[PDB]
Structure 1
Amino acid sequence: MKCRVWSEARVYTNINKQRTEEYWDYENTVIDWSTNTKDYEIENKVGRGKYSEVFQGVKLDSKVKIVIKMLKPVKKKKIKREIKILTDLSNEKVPPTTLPFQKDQYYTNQKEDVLKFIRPYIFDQPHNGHANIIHLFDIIKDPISKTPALVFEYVDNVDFRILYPKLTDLEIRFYMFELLKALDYCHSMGIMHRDVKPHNVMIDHKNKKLRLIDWGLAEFYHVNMEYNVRVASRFFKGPELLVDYRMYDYSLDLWSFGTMLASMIFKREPFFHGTSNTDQLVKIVKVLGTSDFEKYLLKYEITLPREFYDMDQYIRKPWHRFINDGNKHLSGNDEIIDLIDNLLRYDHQERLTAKEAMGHPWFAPIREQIE
């Protein structure tokens, strides 16, 4: 019961009032494990993360190449949550983002101060964002090792530290547009991803194919719910997580998207490089400035956690200052700077929504090629 000023999502506010217990209540599901990995031939390791080791394999009946995510020990409800979210997203018969746009059903937060953040531009067309969500094929648990495991669609992915430096301006615009479609869809489904970052974005470059993976930290959005702030990874944590504003929403994903984008555009990786939890906030404020930070704390009447009282006064760094000859081919236009500026805001309510971001001028060359 931490928050003083209450906050609600600007968009898609009431999805989980519309949808009921059988959709969002992951704790009261029972996982239908497959008793055997007999349907699969498990090959070599293709990746890892904080919560898993991931192995390439083949589904023997169809010969489809898959991955198997072997889950490290965690609370069992986290496993139920990942499975529920993945199945909700894949099993929706008519993805809401494929339907005709309805503004009154979109901008659902009707507070006067929140409505001022509606942008003059918006992508208002149906889209295939649901097709950018990784597909879960099976749930398996070996009888001998007792290891819970998730079988997914395989993506032929290269580490971002190898791929991203090779990408052209137009290719970054393309892929980041694909990511926004995925986010618009999961948000429309009343779900926050909460771990948006390069390692969780599979790209098969030769097939121009993008998948948003790793749904293990995702959560259902409920109006005025206070969430744990110890989620995501240090470098991608929004200001709300650092100052312990627990009543956050889908906009957290857009901060993460923005920080990922800022890294690609300015070629500084990671963009906010904190040496500790404390210093992570310092790295952010060093950029956005102390002045707007304090206005933000005042707006929500946030009592700053104890650790941040040794913070110095910082003058805002204009984005222009991040431009240099190494990156100017990606950063040297007004459009990208304005996009980044409108994503990376202290106040979560101020940030572009996925749909607004998709309608931003920077994506014009991508939108042009849709029809």
Structure 2
Amino acid sequence: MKCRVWSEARVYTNINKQRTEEYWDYENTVIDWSTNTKDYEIENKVGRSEVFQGVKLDSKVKIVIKMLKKKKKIKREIKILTDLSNEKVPPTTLPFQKDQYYTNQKEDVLKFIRPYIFDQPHNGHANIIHLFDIIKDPISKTPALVFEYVDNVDFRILYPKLTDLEIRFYMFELLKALDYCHSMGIMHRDVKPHNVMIDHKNKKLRLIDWGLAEFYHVNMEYNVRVASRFFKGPELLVDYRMYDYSLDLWSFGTMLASMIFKREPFFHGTSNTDQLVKIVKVLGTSDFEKYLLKYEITLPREFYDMDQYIRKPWHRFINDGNKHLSGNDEIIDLIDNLLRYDHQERLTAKEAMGHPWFAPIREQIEK
């Protein structure tokens, strides 16, 4: 055990004690690869694995084919995708039970319970991309995953078009997706715009790319070489291995800050080490030191001691180009409560969905 001070998820702590090996033991599965002799026609490349849009030959429905180049990780991705899509009664559709939600009973962790929370059933399960098939090329034998197709527009093209209310709408959809996967005992670990497909005309959002996702097990020390540099939480950068779902809320917050302040990426590190320095230059060294002390973290071998930086208030990122998005107190408070060094302090997905910034979206739900 690397960690000196141990940490547990504030919410959804015991999902993978509630659920058994049949649910989370991906090592002990055997993949039934289906040779693609007649099922899927590959058309054009949509991104990059290498990812193609194709067609189901029977129904003529568009699908996505993700060509894989990592055997254990493939089994994990498949188990996660199937666990998420196959759950008959998603937990997030049932009536809210606060005592089954706030499951970590440290006194110091209960102070982070917010006075607001979204306490209603929701359809976040429907925002998880669906895996349709597991195939091999009939000639090359290369393995691939077949998915639901989304008519996406790249975030760099789409996001500048979105109004304040539209950003609120889609970020609420993303939180619903994260609340669902967390309720299922899964951390996405690579939340970023490239992994969020949006079909704007249909107001459709799907969280994709579950290849870094992992099952949350209490006091497990995880690999910190996950996420993507610009969205990596401080826990990854300082090698605090006993992290949880709250990693995804950091990534969410970074994505949100980028959208609201029109600064992409928001924390633009030139290296792994510099990524942390870029975060500290905003959140400040004082709270950084308090965080290292709380968990008794020693920085990884690449790091000199952190220099002293005074916190940069969020309002300093406001300009005439972004004030239509950043010029209210609610968004600043939301961002501030997501981008915290201490993962325990961050809003959970339900708490974030309850935040005042989402009031206009919540008011339109009931029909």
Task: Give unpaired runs (5+ residues) of structure 2.
Answer: none
Give the fraction of aligned pairs with identical amino acids, expressed as a percent: 100
Displacement of 1:37 after TM fit? 4.2
How far, CA to CA, are the matches of 1:306 and 1:79 in structure 2?
Answer: 31
Tell which deviates more after alignment, 140-149 or 20-29: 140-149
Residue 237 (structure 1) aligns with: 232
How far, CA to CA, are the matches of 1:154 and 1:305 in structure 2?
Answer: 41
After the TM superposition, list the runs of 4 or more consecutive aligned residues in structure 1 that deviate by more than 3 angstroms: none
How far, CA to CA, are the matches of 1:146 and 1:278 in structure 2?
Answer: 40
For the residue of structure 2 that corresponds to 1:203, the secondary structure is strand
Contact kept, 8 Å, 2:246 with 2:346, in 1: the verdict is yes
Are 2:182 and 1:187 aligned? yes
Contact kept, 8 Å, 2:37 with 2:138, in 1: the verdict is no
1:208-247 mapped onto 2 (5 Å cutoff) = 208-247=203-242
Displacement of 1:21 after TM fit? 0.3
Contact kept, 8 Å, 2:127 with 2:207, in 1: the verdict is yes
For the residue of structure 2 that corresponds to 1:104, the secondary structure is helix
Displacement of 1:181 after TM fit? 0.1
Contact kept, 8 Å, 1:240 with 1:248, in 2: the verdict is yes
Displacement of 1:30 after TM fit? 0.2
Displacement of 1:146 after TM fit? 2.0
How far, CA to CA, are the matches of 1:251 and 1:89 in structure 2?
Answer: 19
Aligned residues: 366
Contact kept, 8 Å, 2:192 with 2:255, in 1: the verdict is yes
Contact kept, 8 Å, 1:37 with 1:141, in 2: the verdict is no
Displacement of 1:28 after TM fit? 0.6
Q: Deviations over 1:103-141 (max 9, x none)?
A: 000000000000000000000000000000001111001
Contact kept, 8 Å, 1:41 with 1:57, in 2: the verdict is yes
Instruction: Provide TM-score, normalisation by structure 2.
Output: 0.99
Displacement of 1:38 after TM fit? 1.4
Tell which deviates more after alignment, 37-46 or 109-118: 37-46
Tell which deviates more after alignment, 175-184 or 142-151: 142-151
Q: Deviations over 1:196-247 (max 9, x none)?
A: 0000000001111100000000000000000000011110000000000000
How far, CA to CA, are the matches of 2:305 and 2:7 in structure 1?
Answer: 28
How far, CA to CA, are the matches of 1:240 and 1:141 in structure 2?
Answer: 37
How far, CA to CA, are the matches of 1:253 and 1:146 in structure 2?
Answer: 35
Tell which deviates more after alignment, 328-337 or 299-308: 299-308
Contact kept, 8 Å, 1:37 with 1:140, in 2: the verdict is no
Q: Deviations over 1:118-170 (max 9, x none)?
A: 00000000000000000111100124312110100100111111111111000
Tell which deviates more after alignment, 78-87 or 33-42: 33-42
How far, CA to CA, are the matches of 2:131 and 2:179 in structure 1?
Answer: 19
How far, CA to CA, are the matches of 1:105 and 1:257 in structure 2?
Answer: 24
For the residue of structure 2 that corresponds to 1:248, the secondary structure is coil
How far, CA to CA, are the matches of 1:348 and 1:34 in structure 2?
Answer: 41
Contact kept, 8 Å, 2:66 with 2:144, in 1: the verdict is yes
Instruction: Give the one of 356, 367, 370 matched to 2:365.
Output: 370
How far, CA to CA, are the matches of 2:307 and 2:221 in structure 1?
Answer: 29
Residue 294 (structure 1) aligns with: 289
How far, CA to CA, are the matches of 2:97 and 2:214 in structure 1?
Answer: 25
Contact kept, 8 Å, 2:285 with 2:306, in 1: the verdict is no
Contact kept, 8 Å, 1:194 with 1:232, in 2: the verdict is yes
Instruction: Provide TM-score, normalisation by structure 1.
Output: 0.98
Residues 37 and 185 (structure 1), Cα distance of their counterparts in 2 relative to 1, 3 Å cut: farther
What do you get for the CA RMSD once the two structures are aligned? 0.7
Residue 125 (structure 1) aligns with: 120
How far, CA to CA, are the matches of 2:36 and 2:272 in structure 1?
Answer: 42
Contact kept, 8 Å, 1:3 with 1:302, in 2: the verdict is yes
Q: Deviations over 1:248-297 (max 9, x none)?
A: 00000000000000000001110000000110000000000000000000
Contact kept, 8 Å, 1:258 with 1:343, in 2: the verdict is yes
Displacement of 1:29 after TM fit? 0.4
Contact kept, 8 Å, 2:221 with 2:242, in 1: the verdict is yes
How far, CA to CA, are the matches of 1:36 and 1:365 in structure 2?
Answer: 47
